[PDB]
Amino acid sequence: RMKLSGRPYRHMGVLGTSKLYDIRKTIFTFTPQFIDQQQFYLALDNKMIVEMLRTDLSYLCSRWRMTGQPTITFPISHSMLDEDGTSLNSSILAALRKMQDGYFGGARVQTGKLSEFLTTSCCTHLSFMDPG
Amino acid sequence: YVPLKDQRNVSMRFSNQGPLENDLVVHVALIAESQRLQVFLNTYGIQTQTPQQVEPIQIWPQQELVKAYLQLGINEKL
Amino acid sequence: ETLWDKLDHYYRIVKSTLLLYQSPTTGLFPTKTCGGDQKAKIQDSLYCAAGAWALALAYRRIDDDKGRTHELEHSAIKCMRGILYCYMRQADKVQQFKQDPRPTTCLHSVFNVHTGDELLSYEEYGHLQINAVSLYLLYLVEMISSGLQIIYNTDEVSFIQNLVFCVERVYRVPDFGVWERGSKYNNGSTELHSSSVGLAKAALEAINGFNLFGNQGCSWSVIFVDLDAHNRNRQTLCSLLPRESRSHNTDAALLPCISYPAFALDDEVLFSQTLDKVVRKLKGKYGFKRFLRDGYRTSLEDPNRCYYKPAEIKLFDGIECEFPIFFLYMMIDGVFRGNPKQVQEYQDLLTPVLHHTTEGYPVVPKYYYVPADFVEYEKNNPGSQKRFPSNCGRDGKLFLWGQALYIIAKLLADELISPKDIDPVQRYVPLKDQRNVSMRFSNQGPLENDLVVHVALIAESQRLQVFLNTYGIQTQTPQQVEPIQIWPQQELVKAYLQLGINEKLGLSGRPDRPIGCLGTSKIYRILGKTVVCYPIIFDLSDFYMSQDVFLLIDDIKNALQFIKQYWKMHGRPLFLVLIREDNIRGSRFNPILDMLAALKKGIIGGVKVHVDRLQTLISGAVVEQLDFLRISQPDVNISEWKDKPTHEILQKLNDCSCLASQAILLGILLKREGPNFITKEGTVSDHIERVYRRAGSQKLWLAVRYGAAFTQKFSSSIAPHITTFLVHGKQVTLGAFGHEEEVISNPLSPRVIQNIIYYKCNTHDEREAVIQQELVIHIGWIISNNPELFSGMLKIRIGWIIHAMEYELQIRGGDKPALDLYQLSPSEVKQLLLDILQPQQNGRCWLNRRQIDGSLNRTPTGFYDRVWQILERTPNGIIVAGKHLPQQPTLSDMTMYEMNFSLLVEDTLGNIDQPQYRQIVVELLMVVSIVLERNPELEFQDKVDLDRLVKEAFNEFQKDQSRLKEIEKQDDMTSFYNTPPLGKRGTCSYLTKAVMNLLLE
């Protein structure tokens, strides 16, 4: 009635995808935007992938002014295997080993499963997608 | 004496929800004791407030009201 | 199913129907749901807001409401803030209407909903409507009492005060009506409406003594109300209540004024007869019609002529549109009266006519119309054919007022709330609780009147006090009442003028108007000092009838009766009486002694009275607070001395002592030189005032009347008399006998009436003005206390009355010369008026009785209906004294009981010069009507000449006297006027003979 088009489309930061979400009694998790190969080719390099993980973890651990612990999902793709496709690259395995033992880049990283993280993680309840 | 149709919003006898109903909602307030305890609870997502942040309000034990009530009803002549 | 499902269904209905089209910029709903209309009404949006508030109150009973009450309450608040802002946008019009109420200065009622601005000129709407303002005030005080907050600052309090002051004067100015059409002819005229005045009375009663800020408020949240306006509104209602308007026998708009929105008619039996009449005359198969003979948006109606042509209303009958919304109102009335049978019958009637949306939502269309195929078939058989629904009954168009009323009625019928919750201000009360209510009923009960009135005796001078004490009468001179203060009536009017003043907007406050006896009967506190005032009847009056003891006794008795019968406030009234030493004036001292003795006895004409000192009465009594001020034969003839020089007239004035000669010389001087001339005793005006006061002291009635004519003064009570005469149904004409006369049909401002009467006075005579003043005040008083004495009167003419008075006095004089009327005392003129106004008996000459009846324009009871049934059985018409009354226009324009026919027949009858001739004519008409109604076999063959019939009777009775008494043919028919109608050989027999002769031929 008031000719309002709502929020225009914009790129979504890493600060918003970290927190969990609730849409119609369902749990959803969103991957970070820099593993998007359909926009640009700079994400096709494993070393660059490692450096973006490092800077993004540092930035996330820097401010974190919202309550609860963060949550990052890092899917492993077919493009991050070797040429033979039978083993992951050395950089990816090394990065996984570093993010184990609770010290990677400039932040403490703790590993586990989504089952344990659901009890201690911020959840945002969304209401405007409920049916009218 | 009131009729059966009037017993809806009387005081000290019947509730506002009707005689044959019990759906009262009660309020609770979460207040911590120490900064260490409140930060530890916040680490697990528990929200609680330290007593030093409620300065306009005061929290007192039950004996204060007892002594205040004891102060009342004093007469010197009798 | 719990309450949640039903309340969610109501919420979705409201969201899909009512709140969908709300305008957020103003909060006002539009009048159309499609096409982007920019027009908005006040009634529909207000009703929608009331329904939303009712739904919010219904849903408030849940503590887990999820805030659903929130949006409804805030929508009501936003709508009310928007309408208040739109009202306060126009400020000059309010001030203009407060002084000169006219359609030009009326407050606009329709404006753009997008920006709150006027879109249409007032020449195509009228814009004058008071029911909306009164209903808005009633609803706003309703929700303030409920607990809602709408006002913020003190400015809105001042605006409410100004609105109350403006609406106080609604009982005189005609309105355009609820339907905007006013008269049924729809020609552009305004008529009084009972519903508007009833709503105004209800709002005025409700607004009295209420805190506007709600929970918190000390001294700047109260409303002051004048009881005189409420009393006059109640009188206008009780007079006009049986018939909604002069031109409308019955309309459907009467229900809201006599139903839940108002609850104004506390008469039960008259309520029952009104309800029965409206139900019987307005019931329809599809609901209730608006009123009879109504071509509103019908098949024959065309969008090319705003004003209906005469005789079109006759063609417009039988095809009246239908509104089912009034079933909901009758449902409401039945459910508040606890009659489930009416509830079930009206629900069953409403079920089939209701329509459904795509989702099945209930729909209530606006009006119903008949197709063009059944234009004539419907006339033969009423209701036989089936009508068709309107455009707003299928899709795309709605009638938000209709669904609002439907949803509120369904909410009440489902018993989800109680009548007390929806009416916290207890507008409607049962018969068993009507015992101690304020402004409505007395503590003694409805069918009881035994009020006791307190009266205080206060002297004026110590010599008078001791003189009265010597005879046993006890009184107190004011100098021992030091703590209490006695003030005149102008202190209170100036104080009331002080209040209600705001600087930002421009505000004049309460207009300077006289205060009635009820207002002055109270006790006031100004600056912490008690103030008591006496009625305006005791203060010095420049007029002359205040020097007669009998007139004062009658006036004080009338005031006591008025206080007894129109007092309902808590606490006994206070009455103050003052006696002056100049009243005794020698031998005149006896009647005042008798009156004081009767007052001391305890009863005054069946009215109980109490007397005691003022200090005891003032103590232990409620005193009302006014704290706003703290916050803020002659030897000189006209012809002979007209041409005399100025110096000669001045010398004659100097050396003459006669009062009449002095007055006539002053008149000549003022007519020739002017009021600004200087004489030996100051200015001309000062000398006139001094001589007039001297004459008033000396009680020379002719001299005081002539001086009063000089003074250019008028009584401040003519307007109530003219308006009560108008609302009674009578007509008043001002003028002189045998000269030009002015007819008044609608209320007018005092300035115009004063102008016209004084121009006429300057034209014809000298001392008449005061004479018509005395006659009109006496006639008004008599009609107020003895209404049935003026029965049969339609047009009252003071000149004809006074001519008949002089003629009767001349007859009474006989051999002695007739006494001049200018020298008669007020008691004598009152007695003579009461004597001539009497129904009269035999003994006197029948010619004099005929003359006095004709001069008063007397008509027999039931004459108008007899004339109407005559014309219905008169194919040609009736021609009397050259005037023609064609049958076709009066049958195609007029009906049985409407007043326009009575006016027309009176107009055509009033051309008769001889009053007794007119009485003979009306008697002949009555005889003809009786003889024709007794036998339907005989019918007129052509138009009848009443002059021919009376001439035939003249000749026949001439022959009869020639045979009996051997009297020759004498000119003039005066012997007939002498002859009584009935007896051995009366006029009625000869009238019957003439009728028989005419019918035989």
- Is C969 within 8 Å of C958 (Cβ atoms)? yes
Give the nearest chain B residue to A69 (CA atoms): B43
- Is C799 within 8 Å of C793 (Cβ atoms)? no
Q: CB-based contact (8 Å) between A61 and chain B?
A: no
Cα of C850 vs its chain's centroid, Å:
33
Token look-up 């089939």 returns: C352
Q: How many whole angstroms separate alpha carbon C58 and alpha carbon C71? A: 14
C944 forms beta bridges with C878
Q: How many whole angstroms separate alpha carbon C444 and alpha carbon C446? A: 7
Full DSSP string of B6-73: TTTS-SSS--TT-TT----------B-S-HHHHHHHHHTT---B-GGG-TTS----HHHHHHHHHHSS
Q: How many whole angstroms separate alpha carbon C69 and alpha carbon C88? A: 28
Residues of C in contact with B25 (CB under 8 A): 63-64
Method used to obtain the model: cryo-EM
Which B residues in the span 29-68 are in contact with A, Cβ-Cβ below 8 Å? Answer: 42, 44-45, 47
Q: At what angle do helices C826-836 and C549-565 cross, to 10 degrees?
A: 60
Q: How far is B42 from chain A (nearest CA, A)?
A: 8
Q: Which of B38, B39, B41, B43 to mutate to test the interface with A (most CBs of A within 10 A)?
A: B43
A42 forms beta bridges with none
Interface residues of chain B, partner chain C, Cβ below 8 Å: 5, 16-17, 23-25
- Whole-number Cα distances in Å, C1001 to C337, C874, C939, C942: 64, 16, 11, 11
- Whole-number Cα distances in Å, B20 to B12, B14, C268, C546, C882: 16, 10, 39, 74, 86
Helices within C60-123 (DSSP H only): 68-89, 92-99
Give the nearest chain C residue to B5 (CA atoms): C418
Give the nearest chain C residue to B23 (CA atoms): C63
Q: How far is B10 from chain A (nearest CA, A)?
A: 38
Per the CB < 8 Å rule, is B44 touching A122? no
**3-state class (DSSP) for residue C877:** strand
Token pair in block for residue B8:
């809806």
Per the CB < 8 Å rule, is A120 touching B45? yes
Q: How many whole angstroms separate alpha carbon C821 and alpha carbon C771? A: 9
End-to-end CA distance of chain A: 15
A4-13: Cβ within 8 A, 24+ apart: none
Q: How far is A44 from chain B (nearest CA, A)?
A: 37
- Is A15 within 8 Å of A117 (Cβ atoms)? no
Per the CB < 8 Å rule, is B42 touching A67? yes
Give the nearest chain C residue to B26 (CA atoms): C63
**3-state class (DSSP) for residue C366:** coil
Q: How far is C62 from chain B (nearest CA, A)?
A: 8
Q: Which of B2, B4, B8 to mutate to test the interface with C (most CBs of C within 10 A)?
A: B8
Cα of C427 vs its chain's centroid, Å:
24
Q: How many whole angstroms separate alpha carbon C806 and alpha carbon C821? A: 7
3-state secondary structure C517-569: HHHHCCCEEECCEEEECCCCCCCCCCCCHHHCHHHHHHHHHHHHHHHHHCCCC
- Is C857 within 8 Å of C793 (Cβ atoms)? yes
Residues of B in contact with C63 (CB under 8 A): 17, 23-25
Give the nearest chain B residue to C61 (CA atoms): B17
- Is C898 within 8 Å of C247 (Cβ atoms)? yes
- The secondary element (H helix, E strand) that includes residue C911 is none
Full DSSP string of C279-343: HHHHEETTEE-SBSS--SS-SS--TT-SSPPTTHHHHHTT---BBTHHHHHHHHHHHHTT-HHHH
Cα-based torsion angle of the residue sequence C125, C128, C131, C137 in order, rounded to the nearest 10 degrees: 110
Instruction: Please provide the size of chain B in residues.
Output: 78
- Whole-number Cα distances in Å, C80 to A94, B31, C77, C143, C472: 70, 43, 5, 10, 65
End-to-end CA distance of chain C: 86
Per the CB < 8 Å rule, is C61 touching B16? yes
Per the CB < 8 Å rule, is C61 touching B23? no
Q: How many whole angstroms separate alpha carbon C952 and alpha carbon C992? A: 12
Neighbours of chain B (3+ CB pairs under 8 A): A, C
Cα of C986 vs its chain's centroid, Å:
44
- The secondary element (H helix, E strand) that includes residue C873 is none
Interface residues of chain C, partner chain B, Cβ below 8 Å: 61, 63-64, 418
- Is C363 within 8 Å of C356 (Cβ atoms)? yes
Token look-up 């049909």 returns: C745
- The secondary element (H helix, E strand) that includes residue C978 is helix C974-978
Q: How far is A73 from chain B (nearest CA, A)?
A: 21
The percent helix, strand, coil of chain A (3-state, each to 5) is 35, 10, 55
Residues of C in contact with B16 (CB under 8 A): 61
Name the region of C91 (left: φ>0; alpha: ψ -120 to 50; beta: rest): alpha
Determine how β-strand C795-797 pairs with β-strand C731-735: parallel
Neighbours of chain C (3+ CB pairs under 8 A): B
Q: After which residues is chain C broken (C to N over 2.5 A)?
A: 632
B vs C, Cβ pairs < 8 A, gives: 9
Q: How many whole angstroms separate alpha carbon C77 and alpha carbon C80? A: 5
Determine how β-strand A123-125 pairs with β-strand A20-22: parallel
CA torsion through residues C803, C809, C811, C815, sign:
negative
Amino acid occupying residue C595? M
CA angle C77–C78–C83, rounded 5-degree value = 100
- Whole-number Cα distances in Å, B27 to B24, B30, C93: 10, 10, 54
End-to-end CA distance of chain B: 38
CA angle C19–C21–C26, rounded 5-degree value = 90
Neighbours of chain A (3+ CB pairs under 8 A): B
- Is C662 within 8 Å of C560 (Cβ atoms)? no
The percent helix, strand, coil of chain C (3-state, each to 5) is 50, 5, 45
Nominal resolution (angstroms): 4.2
Alpha-carbon Rg for chain A, nearest whole angstrom, is 17
Cα of C445 vs its chain's centroid, Å:
27
Per the CB < 8 Å rule, is B44 touching A120? yes
Residues of B in contact with A120 (CB under 8 A): 44-45
- Is B59 within 8 Å of B75 (Cβ atoms)? no
Instruction: Please provide the size of chain A in residues.
Output: 132
Give the nearest chain B residue to C64 (CA atoms): B25
How many CB atoms lie under 10 A from the CB of residue C164? 22
Give the nearest chain A residue to B44 (CA atoms): A120
Give the nearest chain C residue to B15 (CA atoms): C61
A vs B, Cβ pairs < 8 A, gives: 8
Q: How far is B11 from chain C (nearest CA, A)?
A: 16
Give the nearest chain B residue to A122 (CA atoms): B45
Q: Which of C2, C3, C63, C417 to mutate to test the interface with B (most CBs of B within 10 A)?
A: C63
- Is C119 within 8 Å of C129 (Cβ atoms)? no
Residues of B in contact with C64 (CB under 8 A): 23, 25
Q: How far is B69 from chain A (nearest CA, A)?
A: 44
Full DSSP string of C8-67: HHHHHHHHHHTGGG--TTT----S-SSTT-----SHHHHHHHHHHHHHHHHHTT-TT-TT
Token pair in block for residue C346:
């009206």
User: Within 13 A of C359's CA, how many CA atoms are on the CB side?
Assistant: 6
In the sheet with C624-626, reading across from the earlier edge strand, the strands are C485-486, C529-532, C524-526, C624-626
**3-state class (DSSP) for residue C582:** coil
Q: How many whole angstroms separate alpha carbon C484 and alpha carbon C481? A: 6
Residues of C in contact with B3 (CB under 8 A): none
Of C61, C64, C418, nearest to B25 by CB-CB distance is: C64
Give the nearest chain A residue to B47 (CA atoms): A67
- Whole-number Cα distances in Å, C971 to C919, C968, C975: 20, 10, 10
